[PDB]
Design an enzyme around this catalytic site. Structure first.
Site, PDB file in Angstrom:
ATOM      1  N   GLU A 131      -8.156   6.327  -0.088  1.00  0.00           N
ATOM      2  CA  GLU A 131      -7.052   7.305   0.122  1.00  0.00           C
ATOM      3  C   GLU A 131      -6.205   7.432  -1.144  1.00  0.00           C
ATOM      4  O   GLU A 131      -5.941   8.555  -1.560  1.00  0.00           O
ATOM      5  CB  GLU A 131      -6.307   6.932   1.415  1.00  0.00           C
ATOM      6  CG  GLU A 131      -7.169   7.291   2.615  1.00  0.00           C
ATOM      7  CD  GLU A 131      -6.830   6.586   3.904  1.00  0.00           C
ATOM      8  OE1 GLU A 131      -5.690   6.140   3.969  1.00  0.00           O
ATOM      9  OE2 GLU A 131      -7.701   6.562   4.854  1.00  0.00           O
TER      10      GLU A 131
ATOM     11  N   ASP B  24       2.369   6.017   0.447  1.00  0.00           N
ATOM     12  CA  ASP B  24       1.718   6.800   1.501  1.00  0.00           C
ATOM     13  C   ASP B  24       2.398   6.458   2.828  1.00  0.00           C
ATOM     14  O   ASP B  24       2.090   5.405   3.397  1.00  0.00           O
ATOM     15  CB  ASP B  24       0.214   6.535   1.521  1.00  0.00           C
ATOM     16  CG  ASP B  24      -0.534   7.363   2.538  1.00  0.00           C
ATOM     17  OD1 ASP B  24       0.111   7.848   3.507  1.00  0.00           O
ATOM     18  OD2 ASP B  24      -1.778   7.504   2.396  1.00  0.00           O
TER      19      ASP B  24
ATOM     20  N   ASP C 196     -10.324  13.567   5.634  1.00  0.00           N
ATOM     21  CA  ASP C 196      -9.334  12.485   5.711  1.00  0.00           C
ATOM     22  C   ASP C 196      -9.387  12.046   7.186  1.00  0.00           C
ATOM     23  O   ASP C 196      -8.981  12.839   8.053  1.00  0.00           O
ATOM     24  CB  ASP C 196      -7.951  12.963   5.305  1.00  0.00           C
ATOM     25  CG  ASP C 196      -6.825  11.967   5.478  1.00  0.00           C
ATOM     26  OD1 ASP C 196      -7.093  10.767   5.710  1.00  0.00           O
ATOM     27  OD2 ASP C 196      -5.709  12.385   5.274  1.00  0.00           O
TER      28      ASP C 196
ATOM     29  N   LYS D 102      -8.655   3.823  14.348  1.00  0.00           N
ATOM     30  CA  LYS D 102      -8.751   3.348  12.948  1.00  0.00           C
ATOM     31  C   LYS D 102      -8.196   1.929  12.829  1.00  0.00           C
ATOM     32  O   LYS D 102      -8.606   1.226  11.901  1.00  0.00           O
ATOM     33  CB  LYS D 102      -7.981   4.263  12.005  1.00  0.00           C
ATOM     34  CG  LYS D 102      -8.261   4.015  10.538  1.00  0.00           C
ATOM     35  CD  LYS D 102      -7.838   5.203   9.708  1.00  0.00           C
ATOM     36  CE  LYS D 102      -7.848   4.906   8.219  1.00  0.00           C
ATOM     37  NZ  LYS D 102      -7.351   6.098   7.482  1.00  0.00           N
TER      38      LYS D 102
END
Ligand SMILES: C/C(=C\CNc1ncnc2c1ncn2[C@@H]1O[C@H](CO)[C@@H](O)[C@H]1O)CO
Length: 377
Positions: free
Chosen positions: A172, A194, A7, A68
């Site tokens: 994800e 999330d 991840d 990211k």
């Protein structure tokens, strides 16, 4: 050889291995199953993870994080413009693309996002290698469902730089659905909620006879647990100024110590109603000693908690779904452990209970490691 599961999160990464029919989420060298996605370039040393994050206080321009947010994007994209105004390290325009500029032994050095993400991947790779006692050359790596081809390719390129062949990129929400073992037979519509440390993502994931499809995505790229900690920070900074005529924002080290205790207090308040925040000599000759209640924690953050429902409404509208059509709700990210978040979700779904796990920050890596296992057969 082996295929590990990683991840690669905005704020943290997590690595799992699949061995003897078990997924193991691996500890870093400090004994933690999640590693801050931080790289520091201070005094001729390069650090990765918690040791790098600790450099952020005294060396903010040398301590790279949140890469990211940049990876596979363009310098002039409206998201990258906002991120440059928020981020303390220099971001330069390399032929249309954001690059990170820091100093190494005073020399200007410019990295693509994927080169910084590669350093994080290399550290996750090394954890897997030590554990398996053999080299690792292959991985499954996760991305957000809304990542485009350029963002996915840049993530694959990060893998290649780290000496990893990324045998599969999975999203994800799919990784979480694998981790929770969601029944692949028939058709199920899942709301994946999330809420991490820095970002909020909501996905409608449809599972149909083993085929996973994300029908719609929405979120808030600057809403996570760190924002809830900052609301608490803001409140006790005001209070400490009222009582003591000290503005803690005048001392960077004091703020760093407060943030660490506030994050602990916040986690305690998912379990208990009241907790003590204590720092001896937060500045010299002045202790910090405060009580925070769950009620005040919730009051300080209620608007941000409620904000999370705006992306939920958008994905249901994008998918042309009614709330009733969602079959199950899967919670991902440590912040979904907050009681009030769960209550707000349950209530929005006109009473329906959200599905959740026990280690929601590890569910994505766990599912990536399952995917690694599925690919090896
Ligand atoms: C013991 C227990 C709950 C207490 N735990 C938590 N309560 C609230 N927020 C949390 C928790 N765990 C991780 N986060 C945040 O998740 C983000 C991603 O790491 C960061 O902002 C963390 O602060 C009930 O099982």
């Amino acid at each position: 050889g082996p295929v590990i599961g990683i991840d690669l999160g905005t704020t943290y990464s997590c690595v799992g291995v699949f061995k003897n029919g078990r997924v193991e989420i691996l500890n870093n060298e400090l004994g933690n199953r999640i590693t801050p996605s931080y790289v520091s370039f201070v005094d001729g040393e390069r650090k990765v993870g918690e040791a790098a994050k600790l450099e952020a206080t005294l060396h903010p321009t040398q301590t790279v994080f949140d890469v990211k947010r940049l990876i596979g994007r363009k310098f002039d994209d409206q998201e990258v413009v906002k991120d440059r105004s928020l981020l303390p390290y220099e971001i330069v325009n390399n032929q249309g693309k954001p690059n990170i500029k820091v100093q190494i032994k005073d020399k200007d050095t410019t990295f693509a996002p994927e080169q910084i993400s590669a350093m994080v991947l290399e550290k996750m790779k090394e954890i897997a290698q030590s554990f398996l006692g053999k080299p690792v050359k292959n991985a499954v790596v996760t991305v957000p469902a809304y990542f485009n081809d350029a963002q996915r390719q840049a993530t694959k390129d990060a893998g290649t730089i780290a000496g990893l062949n990324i045998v599969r990129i999975i999203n994800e929400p799919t990784a979480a659905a694998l981790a929770y073992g969601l029944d692949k037979k028939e058709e199920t519509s899942i709301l994946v909620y999330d809420l991490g440390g820095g970002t909020f993502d909501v996905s409608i994931l449809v599972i149909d006879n083993g085929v996973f499809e994300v029908y719609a995505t929405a979120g808030n790229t600057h809403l996570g647990g760190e924002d809830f900690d900052q609301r608490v920070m803001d409140y006790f900074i005001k209070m400490f100024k009222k009582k003591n005529n000290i503005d803690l924002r005048t001392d960077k080290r004091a703020i760093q110590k407060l943030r660490k205790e506030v994050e602990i207090a916040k986690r305690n308040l998912s379990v208990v109603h009241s907790t003590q925040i204590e720092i001896e000599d937060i500045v010299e000759g002045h202790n910090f000693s405060e009580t925070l209640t769950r009620a005040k924690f919730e009051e300080l953050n209620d608007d941000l908690f409620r904000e999370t429902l705006e992306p939920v409404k958008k994905v249901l509208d994008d998918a042309k779904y009614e709330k009733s059509k969602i079959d199950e709700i899967v919670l991902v990210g440590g912040s979904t452990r907050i009681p009030k978040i769960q209550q707000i979700i349950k209530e929005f779904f006109n009473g329906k209970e959200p599905n959740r796990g026990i280690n929601p920050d590890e569910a994505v890596a766990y599912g990536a490691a399952i995917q690694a296992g599925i690919i090896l057969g």
